[PDB]
Amino acid sequence: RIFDPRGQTIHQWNKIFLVACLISLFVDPLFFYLPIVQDEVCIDIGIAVEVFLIIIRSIADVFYVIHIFMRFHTAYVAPSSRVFGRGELVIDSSKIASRYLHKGFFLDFIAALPLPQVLIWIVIPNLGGSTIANTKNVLRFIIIIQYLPRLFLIFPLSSQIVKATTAWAGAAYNLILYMLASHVLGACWYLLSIERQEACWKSVCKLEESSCQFDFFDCNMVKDSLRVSWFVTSNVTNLCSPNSLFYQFGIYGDAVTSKVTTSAFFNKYFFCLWWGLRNLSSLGQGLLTSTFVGEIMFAIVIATLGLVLFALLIGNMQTYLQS
Amino acid sequence: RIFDPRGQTIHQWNKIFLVACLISLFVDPLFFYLPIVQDEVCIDIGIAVEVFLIIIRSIADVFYVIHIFMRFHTAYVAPSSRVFGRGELVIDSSKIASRYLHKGFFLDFIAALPLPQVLIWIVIPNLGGSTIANTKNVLRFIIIIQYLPRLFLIFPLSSQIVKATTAWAGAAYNLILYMLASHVLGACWYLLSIERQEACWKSVCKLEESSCQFDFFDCNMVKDSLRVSWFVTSNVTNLCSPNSLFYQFGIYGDAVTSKVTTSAFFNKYFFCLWWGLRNLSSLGQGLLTSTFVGEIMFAIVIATLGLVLFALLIGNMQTYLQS
Amino acid sequence: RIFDPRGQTIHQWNKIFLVACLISLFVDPLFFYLPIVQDEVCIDIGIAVEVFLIIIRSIADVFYVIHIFMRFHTAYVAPSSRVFGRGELVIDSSKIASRYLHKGFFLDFIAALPLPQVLIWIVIPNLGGSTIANTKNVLRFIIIIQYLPRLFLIFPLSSQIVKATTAWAGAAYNLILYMLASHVLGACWYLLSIERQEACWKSVCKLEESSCQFDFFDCNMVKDSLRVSWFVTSNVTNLCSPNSLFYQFGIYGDAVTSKVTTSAFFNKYFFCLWWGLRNLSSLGQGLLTSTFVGEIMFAIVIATLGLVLFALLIGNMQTYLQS
Amino acid sequence: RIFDPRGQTIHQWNKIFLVACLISLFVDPLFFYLPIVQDEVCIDIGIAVEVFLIIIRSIADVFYVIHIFMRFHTAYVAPSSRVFGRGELVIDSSKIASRYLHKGFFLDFIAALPLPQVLIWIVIPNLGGSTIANTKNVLRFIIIIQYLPRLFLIFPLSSQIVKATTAWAGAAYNLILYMLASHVLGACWYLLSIERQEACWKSVCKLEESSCQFDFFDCNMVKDSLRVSWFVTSNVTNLCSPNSLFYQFGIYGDAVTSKVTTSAFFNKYFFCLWWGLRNLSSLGQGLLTSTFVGEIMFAIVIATLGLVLFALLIGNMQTYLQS
């Protein structure tokens, strides 16, 4: 059942797979919005939203597995058989599999690994208790390690769609990509702000090591008598604010003053998407960072992305107007 | 009395209609500047300015009715008779009316409906008392529901004018588009800031529900003894300020600190026009919103409009310089 | 002694006239830096800098008069005698004078009028004592009335210089124009901030009509016994500051906090030039104006100039790299 | 042993020399990050990082000397022997040396001088004790005096590499130049902020001439009894802050508020790099300077560099899109 590379089944499958990849690209950064900072100073996770996102990601991974299957069952054109553009067809399944494994299979398999799901379920909780690591909100960012190759996969595939079927197709696509970059940067900023607030809490606990340890900032122990007794005699709610000059919050300060980390899922999502869009359009200006290397590099990445994306938008609109 | 589409009567009518549509597009957002926040914490409406705007709107409406009447009596080129461009003319009134009804009549009829003057006069006040809704200043935005179709009519019609009559007509036209977009965004910002201040007043009333009720911020009840007795012992004047953290004013806070909602019509109009133009040139930067989805979406729309308009301006200037 | 329009004497005269026009365009805005706000809350005029600028403007006006004389004594090509480019020359002095008077003489004569000199010397002081008007700092802006036609003369003449003698000639020329716009806008902003501070002083005087009148803010009367007695008991020092919420300084408030109205000529000049450059590059963003129509219109003009200039710069660099 | 100008040895040497020159351009501004402001209000020099930078710069200068020595022994195409491209080879060493001395030797020699390490070792300390000058942290900027000619050598030489080896070579090259400009501007801003804080300390000492001289702000005298006695009774810590309105810190105040001058080398380097990149992308907006001419000139230079770099980047991206 080898499908023709320039046939109809593969064209329809690629049309569906572009939508599936776009859905996966949209859903992956949403995993960064799960942590919630509560008024009692603790980080919880929205269970219902977590399960919903995991279900969507599982559907996307099923689609990716189907794509890998169809790529093991697709034909190719031999480079040496290209007779005036007529490269014929190859039906050898073994040759197709060898060609796929030599080039293309590795990156597609990496992109199809259910990394967020295993990280959420069978890595952090249950037997894989990372008490020694104590970086539950940091490991989520390794999704980016898988997100970056997957983002690459959107470039050639969509190009094939361009071959499948203009003036309006150069600016709308670039604005969609620009919104995607804004979405990813906003989710990254939200998770980094959560990490910054957790670091401020850890510094406060270090200042108050007499009656605190690095276990009081989890909402599963908020009702403990020790937790409330420490909370009523601590000024963590006032020290961990951008107004107080105790900890350098930097660009993450807007996540504490505006209570973004406490707001509902849609409020926080739209706030962070607008943050990313605004700091991508403004070329990273207004990102008055602290003296921390990671935040500075995040701001530099945002500025560079804004520069290249604005240049692409200007060029695309110039091309559209000239044609 | 069928008019020639390429003739002189229709050309002159289109020249008049371009100016009429430009005036109508300039006047429609001005209805958002009518509400006035007075020093007694209430929202009034300038009766004289409202009457003048309704008169101008009715003039635009009768011009649109004349345009519809004229288009009911215009000839069209038969697609099947296009013999090397010479498509002749169709004179049959019934055929012309049927063709116009099939394509074109609905969208032109929508743009000619006197929706704003109906809403102001015979929808909200008098028989149609919307006491339950209590959203008098929110219904105005449904003018946008009609504004967007009308904004469409400029693009073809002006192009037709281009056919009727370059290097200087590309940058100036896009600057006019920029002015119109900034004016509309400024009017929308003014009305949304009025809504935000009214929402803060409603929150204060809820906090003081013992002596306040949800009909109490109307200027027709200012002289009431109950209202003054409540006001002399109420802290609504400082709770609904961006300085206080009682309510998240966000980007609308600049309309409370600067007191544009209480200024004269020209001052408020120019302030809001400059606000829209500045946040369109800054690509939405400086729009530090709150965690409210509507305000965030407004900021995102402003940033996207700034992106597309600046890209169009750069492309038009590049075309001008290359020509 | 009619000179050849395609000859060498007129070529050299145009080369030196471009320099003279550039110097005159650089010098006219400097007259806006003359008023100085002193620590005694008064506005004085720097006599030495004023005299130097008047001398430079006199030299420029002499050059302009020589230019208009030479234009009265230059030949022209008859439009009806253009036989395949060989349009011959016209030597009749009467015909040349009539042609110049019909078109060209009016605006050239307008630019050659010593308006700033007569305004400074024989309009405001001496016989023309503007005691009733009391707007000495406002009249200077009618230099702009002469400045706008003069700025016109740069555009054709420079093009003629192009005909006298590339890839590098597009970016540098546009940067020179951009610097000129920044210089003019900075001088205008300095004078407007002077006017705003004087208006705040007048408002304070109105608040203190018992012991103040509209002369007390003139530095010639600073040593008056009434002046010192009012000053030792007046709070105009802190009331007219952007920190206090007494007067809406707006975008001009930055000139009071930084004390640029008091500093030396070089400091204030460079601060205002950088202000114009920054608010021209930032597309007018950060110009958070008050509810005053004049300030808002000035900010709108600055933003539109920034838009057109940045688009022109982008287009010029695109042309330079492409060619 | 004259090398062929279009041979293989010179090609490889130029490939090495481009990397060497890039290293030298990256290392020279790092000398500006050496001064450190300590909590005892004094400026020290990191000896270890200074020695490492001196060693790297010495290696780069040895590479420059090797380049000069070898290009003394290369043939050149005779201007009069260019017979249809075949310009032959000049083997005469005397003629090659004469041509090099006439054109090429001066700029290559001035760019190979060990001026930075000479200043660090045998100019400022030891015999050349600049007690009278008292500009230990100011002289470093004369590295820029040699840096600009060395910045020139990149533009031709890199072009040769282009001749030795596209669509991706326009955006990447522009971004490399842009990052280099950001790095240089950040180093210059750090050293200028150090200078501003030192000037504030000098002003404070002038305010405290009774018990202070211009030596208490050197970290070699921090442990002196007079030093500690003055420090315990001096308020230099409060007066020399951006919050206190004592000294106009201007755009350098962000360096004191963020305590970047005290941070470690990596923190300060990345903070200053992000500062330069942000103020270069923002076209100098947000550089609210003081009334000081040097700071204003620095801001104007930053704005002009941002303008030209953004224009070049837009043009390069347009070229990439169209080709």
Author numbering:
A (entry chain D), B (entry chain C), C (entry chain B), D (entry chain A): 58 to 222, 228 to 385
Question: What is written in the article reporting this PDB entry?
Answer:
Cyclic nucleotide-gated ion channels (CNGCs) in plants mediate Ca2+ influx in response to environmental changes. Among numerous plant CNGCs, Medicago truncatula CNGC15a/b/c (MtCNGC15) is localized to the nuclear envelope. The MtCNGC15 was reported to be activated after the sensing of Nod factors and negatively regulated by camodulin (CaM) to fullfil a cycle of Ca2+ release and retrieve between the endoplasmic reticulum/nuclear envelop lumen and the nucleoplasm.
The transmembrane domains (TM) and CPD of the MtCNGC15b show contrasting features in the density map. The well-resolved EM density of TMs enabled the unambiguous assignment of residues 58-385 from MtCNGC15b. The ion conduction pathway of MtCNGC15b consists of the selectivity filter (SF) in pore loops and the inner gate formed by S6. The side chains of Gln347 restrict the permeation path, differing from a glutamic acid in reported animal CNG ion channels like TAX-4 and human CNGA1. Substitution of Gln347 to Glu abolished the Ca2+ currents, suggesting the indispensable role of Gln347 in Ca2+ recognition. Notably, the Cys99/Cys281 pair forms a bridge between the VSD and the PD of MtCNGC15b. Given that the lumenal environment is likely oxidative, these disulfide bonds may play a physiological role in regulating the coupling between the VSD and PD.
